[PDB]
Design a protein around this ligand. Structure first.
Ligand SMILES: CC[C@@]1(O)C[C@H](O)c2c(cc3c(c2O)C(=O)c2c(O)cccc2C3=O)[C@H]1C(=O)OC
Ligand SMILES: Nc1ncnc2c1ncn2[C@@H]1O[C@H](CSCC[C@H](N)C(=O)O)[C@@H](O)[C@H]1O
Ligand SMILES: Nc1ncnc2c1ncn2[C@@H]1O[C@H](CSCC[C@H](N)C(=O)O)[C@@H](O)[C@H]1O
Lengths: 332, 270
């Protein structure tokens, strides 16, 4: 059982069988009628001999089942690869989309452990966010992926804070505007600014406009290593700082400290050890970032001239197998 | 607001485990760095292990976290990590040679990178190995003597072999005219080849006879077969496919065994 258990752990073919299936929209095509190999091969544009060899392992791991002879149907776990499923797992495993494409960086993990440095650029030619800035399909795909992680609703992180005395929110690296939008639905008196990159600002405005939230949340295109576009009572950093090594993280925290109004707060929204280490090693090979322990957080806070006032407890979100925290940061 | 449904979370966790590239690459990185050997040699602190492996200590520790999470390393004493029961199989002296199997510097774990382009293999039926490394699998080994050495040594667990009433006394391209013999042995050979190369090999064997093929949970049958797709364009084959191949070579199957089970197909001239 040890030799068997280690070979399953060490197996590279099972993950890429799952990822090949997601990229081919296999489960979509089955659910739309193509239950046999010959029909599925034509829908996916694959060699019929080759599909069957892929399907065999899909059956052997319990994502596919055989109902009638020759006819394949997804199981309960395999249904999560339907494109419309609310956890978006198909797109998370779609090698044409930005995250599963970034996971190829894991094939150079030894380099990342030897150096502490990301392996993405050594595969694709440019660092992560610079690659997206020249690949609008990947920029859009990454933004859509980050939004679905809270059912695009971000209800749990926005409930974890009291917005009574907050006039303006600046969502720094706020993505497509989901967190800003969630605060505005909860606190009708607050207005908000989303600071994001080229490409993402457009999809953020569309999303915010399509929420009827255009009158209350606006979107600025800029670089958060530079002076922030305005001041605010609540500055949001939501899955931003784990993208960055300690020195860049402090730089970002400092720009936010400079932009705080008197009495205002910086809010860090960030993080099953299997899933904790997945995100942490992703940050290594993608970007050179990391997850940080509470003690490391005090250290980074102090380098930016801030204190961790409190850490508001597990926020459970749908579609994410992993909880998160909200860190409230006070100027020292 | 949020609705958390445990049956769907359990299902989501299952699919993400199945789909994750980090667990296999963490095991392969550990095997490539000889982590378990170094631990067994008395390096239990992260600082020593990083020195022996020439990795940054912060990064090594994050690798260890996942090795702990998946059960290959137990923490035991604060800051001193030890192999578990499963972890001990990464020891270099272990007879299953799993460490050599997962070492990215050896031939097979290096070839396993071909799995990163599985869609190309499924779309086309052609191997992806030469698209990543530049040479088809065996051309690559012919120009890389340490990889030809690693593979030959992996397979025990041509001139580049010879440890020392036929099997293709010791004697040195079975695509060339082969001595003769009363039984020729093709053991885990023909799965390495497309159907036409397999027929060629079987043909030469037929021309020297006065033929037994030794080849084949399903997770391990599909691993070997999908490896043969992305590495070489070979495949595991069914009784029906073996008959069509025997016929193309002038032969007839006259199909006989206990991680993976094997079979014996004795072939006679038609
Ligand atoms: C561990 C059990 C076993 O060794 C059983 C069997 O012996 C076998 C395996 C692997 C390979 C070959 C085998 O024959 C093989 O022939 C081959 C080849 O010709 C050319 C390239 C790679 C391989 C290759 O990776 C192993 C397996 O099936 O699962 C890991
Ligand atoms: N230099 C920079 N200036 C502004 N935004 C940046 C930036 N570098 C990265 N970002 C943005 O930081 C974001 C991190 S992903 C986090 C998105 C969103 N806040 C959420 O929680 O879902 C990306 O969308 C990226 O565009
Ligand atoms: N054109 C060729 N002629 C002869 N041998 C070849 C070949 N191409 C590959 N091989 C060898 O065939 C082997 C398949 S694996 C070993 C097969 C079996 N154990 C045996 O004893 O023969 C590999 O070691 C590979 O080096």
């Amino acid at each position: 059982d040890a030799l068997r258990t280690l070979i399953r752990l060490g197996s590279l073919h099972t993950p890429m069988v799952v990822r090949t299936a997601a990229t081919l929209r296999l489960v979509d095509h089955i659910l739309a009628g193509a239950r046999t190999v010959k029909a599925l091969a034509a829908r996916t544009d694959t060699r019929p001999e080759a599909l069957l060899r892929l399907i065999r392992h899909l059956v052997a791991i319990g994502l596919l089942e055989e109902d009638a002879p020759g006819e394949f149907v997804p199981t309960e776990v395999g249904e999560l690869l339907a494109d419309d499923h609310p956890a978006a797992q198909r797109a998370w495993h779609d090698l044409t989309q930005a995250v599963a494409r970034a996971d190829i960086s894991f094939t150079r993990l030894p380099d990342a452990i030897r150096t502490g440095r990301p392996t993405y650029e050594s595969i694709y030619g440019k660092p992560f966010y610079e690659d997206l800035a020249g690949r609008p399909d990947l920029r859009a795909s990454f933004d859509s992926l980050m939004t679905t992680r809270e059912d695009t609703a971000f209800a749990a992180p926005a409930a974890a804070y009291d917005w009574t005395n907050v006039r303006h929110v600046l969502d720094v690296g706020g993505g497509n505007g989901g967190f800003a939008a969630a605060i505005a639905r909860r606190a009708p008196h607050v207005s908000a600014t989303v600071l994001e990159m080229a490409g993402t600002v457009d999809t953020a405005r569309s999303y915010l406009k399509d929420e009827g939230l255009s009158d209350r949340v606006d979107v600025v295109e800029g670089d958060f290593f530079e002076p922030l576009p305005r001041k605010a009572d609540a500055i949001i950093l939501s899955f931003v700082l784990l993208n960055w090594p300690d020195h860049d993280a402090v730089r970002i925290l400092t720009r936010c400290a400079e932009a705080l109004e008197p009495g205002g707060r910086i809010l860090i929204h960030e993080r099953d050890r299997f899933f904790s280490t997945l995100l942490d090693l992703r940050m290594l090979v993608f970007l050179g970032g990391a997850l940080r322990t509470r003690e490391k957080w005090d250290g980074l806070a102090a380098s930016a001239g801030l204190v961790v006032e409190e850490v508001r407890g597990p926020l459970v979100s749908p579609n994410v197998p992993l909880d998160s925290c909200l860190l409230v940061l006070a100027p020292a």
